[PDB]
């Protein structure tokens, strides 16, 4: 059981994950290029690209997750997740869900980069 909000432009989609639960349901969809941002609250420089992530919805066919690490501490430890922020592209190739690369910090000019390469821009 269990609430999740989501935001849309398009067919991108933005969403806060509320339930851990709610991650594999996500992934159960229409946009090739799934991005999560791990971050937290307390998190100084993951605060200062967090309006950065959410405004990639206008442009790039995405869906954007947003994870709070101290909400969902399970898939922090699942995923691995050594710094805060981290980005995490995702493709669908094949039919699977292919983790194709990951950022480590809130360096602007390298996000971009990987969304350039990874993702697809409208």
């Known amino acids: 059981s269990g609430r999740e909000n989501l935001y849309f432009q398009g067919q991108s989609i ?3 994950l509320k339930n851990t639960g709610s991650l594999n ?5 229409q946009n090739s290029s799934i991005v999560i941002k791990f971050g937290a609250v307390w998190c100084k420089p993951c605060n200062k690209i967090k309006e950065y992530f959410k405004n990639q919805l206008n442009y790039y066919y995405v869906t954007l997750v947003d994870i709070d690490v101290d909400i969902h501490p399970k898939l922090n430890d699942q995923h691995n997740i050594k710094a805060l922020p981290t980005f995490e592209f995702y493709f669908n190739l094949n039919n699977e869900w292919v983790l194709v690369h990951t950022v480590e910090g809130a360096n602007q000019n390298d996000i971009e980069k990987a969304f350039q ?3 697809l821009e409208k």
């Open 14 to 16: 933005y969403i806060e």
């Open 25 to 29: 349901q996500v992934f159960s969809s």
């Open 117 to 119: 390469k990874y993702c």
